[PDB]
Amino acid sequence: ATPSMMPQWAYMHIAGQDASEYLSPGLVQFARATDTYFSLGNKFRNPTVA
Amino acid sequence: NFASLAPRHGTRPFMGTWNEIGTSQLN
Amino acid sequence: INFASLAPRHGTRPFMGTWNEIGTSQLN
Amino acid sequence: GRYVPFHIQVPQKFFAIKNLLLLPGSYTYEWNFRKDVNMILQSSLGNDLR
């Protein structure tokens, strides 16, 4: 809720887009297709903000 | 396009479940 | 109004858990 | 016994490396190992091994 600091947080994913919605649409479709044997979940971070 | 890499639980691939969930901290 | 402003935001959209807001338990 | 040859395999426990996907390339990867007995070892009695 601080407009001054928001761009710095959005870049580092402390508060902003969720991992499923800032990756390229190709990557997120790729990741869920192969999650059975090769997981790309713990790498990209998803923010949570109170 | 990328669904050809997914196991087929029948005729529909097991792709889905959007839980690219990556967040944990002491919190 | 909308009460989504009170829910934690897991990303950009609020969490907003499903319709588990019930209660039903007895010995049966 | 007192004299004991050993064969261990330490993992990586740094936060920015222990999950990196590491696309193809050529990398240098160097780490220093602490050869101090009082730190790496551990005594039940709590005494001094140095």
Short mmCIF file of C-alpha atoms in Angstrom, two decimals:
data_model
loop_
_atom_site.label_atom_id
_atom_site.label_comp_id
_atom_site.label_asym_id
_atom_site.label_seq_id
_atom_site.Cartn_x
_atom_site.Cartn_y
_atom_site.Cartn_z
CA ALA A 1 0.00 0.00 0.00
CA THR A 2 3.03 2.23 -0.58
CA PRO A 3 2.99 3.57 -4.15
CA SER A 4 6.58 4.80 -3.88
CA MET A 5 7.98 1.35 -3.06
CA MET A 6 5.66 -0.72 -5.24
CA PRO A 7 7.85 -0.88 -8.40
CA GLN A 8 10.80 -2.12 -6.35
CA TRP A 9 8.64 -4.85 -4.82
CA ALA A 10 6.99 -5.83 -8.10
CA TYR A 11 10.39 -6.39 -9.70
CA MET A 12 11.55 -8.65 -6.86
CA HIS A 13 8.15 -10.33 -6.36
CA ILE A 14 7.56 -9.33 -2.76
CA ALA A 15 4.11 -8.01 -3.69
CA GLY A 16 2.55 -8.10 -7.13
CA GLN A 17 1.75 -10.63 -9.83
CA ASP A 18 1.51 -14.28 -8.88
CA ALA A 19 3.92 -16.73 -10.48
CA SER A 20 1.15 -18.22 -12.59
CA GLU A 21 0.39 -14.80 -14.09
CA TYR A 22 3.68 -13.01 -14.74
CA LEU A 23 5.59 -15.78 -16.49
CA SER A 24 5.16 -16.05 -20.23
CA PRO A 25 2.01 -17.98 -21.18
CA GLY A 26 4.24 -20.56 -22.83
CA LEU A 27 6.26 -21.24 -19.69
CA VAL A 28 3.27 -21.65 -17.38
CA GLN A 29 1.56 -24.00 -19.84
CA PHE A 30 4.83 -25.92 -20.15
CA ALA A 31 5.30 -26.17 -16.38
CA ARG A 32 1.92 -27.68 -15.57
CA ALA A 33 2.21 -30.19 -18.42
CA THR A 34 5.39 -31.76 -17.04
CA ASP A 35 4.82 -31.31 -13.30
CA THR A 36 4.47 -35.08 -12.84
CA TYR A 37 8.19 -35.77 -13.30
CA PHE A 38 10.02 -32.42 -13.67
CA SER A 39 8.79 -29.69 -11.33
CA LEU A 40 9.32 -25.97 -11.96
CA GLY A 41 7.31 -24.83 -8.96
CA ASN A 42 9.79 -24.03 -6.20
CA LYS A 43 11.87 -21.91 -8.47
CA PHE A 44 9.70 -19.06 -9.49
CA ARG A 45 8.17 -17.22 -6.40
CA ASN A 46 4.64 -16.29 -5.75
CA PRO A 47 3.94 -13.33 -3.55
CA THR A 48 1.52 -13.18 -0.66
CA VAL A 49 0.53 -9.82 0.81
CA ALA A 50 -1.63 -9.20 3.86
CA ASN B 1 1.22 -27.73 -27.91
CA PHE B 2 3.14 -28.66 -24.75
CA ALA B 3 0.58 -31.25 -23.58
CA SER B 4 2.40 -34.01 -25.49
CA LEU B 5 4.81 -34.31 -22.54
CA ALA B 6 2.10 -35.16 -20.00
CA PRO B 7 1.09 -38.64 -18.78
CA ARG B 8 -2.26 -39.78 -20.16
CA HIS B 9 -4.63 -40.83 -17.38
CA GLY B 10 -6.86 -42.40 -19.99
CA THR B 11 -7.18 -40.10 -23.00
CA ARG B 12 -6.93 -36.76 -21.15
CA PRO B 13 -3.39 -35.78 -20.08
CA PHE B 14 -2.71 -35.21 -16.39
CA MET B 15 -1.83 -31.56 -17.10
CA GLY B 16 -3.44 -28.91 -14.92
CA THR B 17 -3.46 -27.78 -11.29
CA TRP B 18 -2.01 -24.29 -11.12
CA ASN B 19 0.09 -24.57 -8.06
CA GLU B 20 3.35 -23.21 -9.16
CA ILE B 21 3.25 -22.28 -5.44
CA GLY B 22 6.66 -21.21 -4.22
CA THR B 23 6.31 -19.29 -1.00
CA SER B 24 7.49 -20.10 2.46
CA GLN B 25 9.27 -18.12 5.13
CA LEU B 26 9.40 -18.45 8.93
CA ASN B 27 6.36 -16.16 9.00
CA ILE C 1 -20.25 -3.43 -1.53
CA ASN C 2 -17.45 -5.96 -1.98
CA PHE C 3 -15.62 -7.55 0.95
CA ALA C 4 -12.69 -8.88 -1.10
CA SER C 5 -10.65 -6.03 0.41
CA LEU C 6 -10.52 -8.05 3.66
CA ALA C 7 -9.03 -11.21 2.22
CA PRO C 8 -5.29 -11.93 1.94
CA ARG C 9 -3.98 -11.56 -1.60
CA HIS C 10 -2.08 -14.64 -2.78
CA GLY C 11 -0.61 -12.80 -5.73
CA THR C 12 -2.93 -10.19 -7.21
CA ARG C 13 -6.38 -11.72 -6.66
CA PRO C 14 -7.71 -12.35 -3.14
CA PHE C 15 -7.60 -15.82 -1.61
CA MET C 16 -11.38 -16.06 -1.07
CA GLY C 17 -11.70 -19.65 0.08
CA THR C 18 -14.48 -21.91 -1.19
CA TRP C 19 -17.92 -22.46 0.34
CA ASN C 20 -16.67 -24.46 3.32
CA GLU C 21 -18.52 -22.00 5.59
CA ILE C 22 -20.73 -24.68 7.14
CA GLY C 23 -20.98 -26.73 10.29
CA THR C 24 -22.37 -30.25 10.65
CA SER C 25 -21.11 -32.70 13.26
CA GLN C 26 -22.76 -35.10 15.70
CA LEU C 27 -22.36 -38.65 16.92
CA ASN C 28 -24.18 -40.25 13.97
CA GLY D 1 37.01 -47.06 16.64
CA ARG D 2 39.51 -44.28 17.17
CA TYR D 3 41.01 -44.05 13.67
CA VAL D 4 38.20 -43.98 11.13
CA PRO D 5 38.36 -43.41 7.36
CA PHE D 6 35.16 -41.76 6.19
CA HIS D 7 33.27 -41.10 2.96
CA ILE D 8 30.61 -38.41 3.25
CA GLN D 9 28.66 -36.31 0.77
CA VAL D 10 27.68 -32.85 2.00
CA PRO D 11 24.71 -31.14 0.33
CA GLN D 12 24.28 -27.53 -0.75
CA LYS D 13 22.41 -25.35 1.74
CA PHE D 14 22.61 -21.84 0.29
CA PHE D 15 19.30 -20.24 -0.56
CA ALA D 16 20.16 -18.77 -3.97
CA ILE D 17 21.81 -21.91 -5.37
CA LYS D 18 20.08 -24.91 -3.90
CA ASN D 19 17.24 -24.76 -6.44
CA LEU D 20 18.71 -23.01 -9.49
CA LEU D 21 17.81 -24.64 -12.79
CA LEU D 22 21.12 -23.66 -14.45
CA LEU D 23 20.49 -23.56 -18.20
CA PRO D 24 23.34 -24.85 -20.40
CA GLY D 25 26.72 -23.18 -20.20
CA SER D 26 30.14 -23.49 -18.60
CA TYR D 27 30.43 -22.57 -14.95
CA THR D 28 33.03 -22.37 -12.22
CA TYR D 29 31.81 -23.61 -8.86
CA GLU D 30 34.21 -23.34 -5.94
CA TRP D 31 33.67 -23.75 -2.21
CA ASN D 32 35.95 -23.72 0.84
CA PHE D 33 35.71 -26.50 3.42
CA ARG D 34 36.47 -25.85 7.08
CA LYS D 35 39.03 -28.34 8.40
CA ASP D 36 38.63 -27.44 12.07
CA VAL D 37 37.78 -30.30 14.41
CA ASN D 38 35.92 -28.24 17.01
CA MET D 39 33.41 -27.15 14.37
CA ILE D 40 32.88 -30.09 12.02
CA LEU D 41 32.91 -32.74 14.75
CA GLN D 42 30.68 -32.92 17.83
CA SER D 43 31.32 -34.45 21.25
CA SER D 44 28.59 -35.86 23.46
CA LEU D 45 30.47 -34.92 26.62
CA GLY D 46 30.83 -31.34 25.40
CA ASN D 47 34.58 -31.24 26.01
CA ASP D 48 37.24 -29.67 23.77
CA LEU D 49 38.43 -31.68 20.77
CA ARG D 50 41.03 -29.16 19.61
#
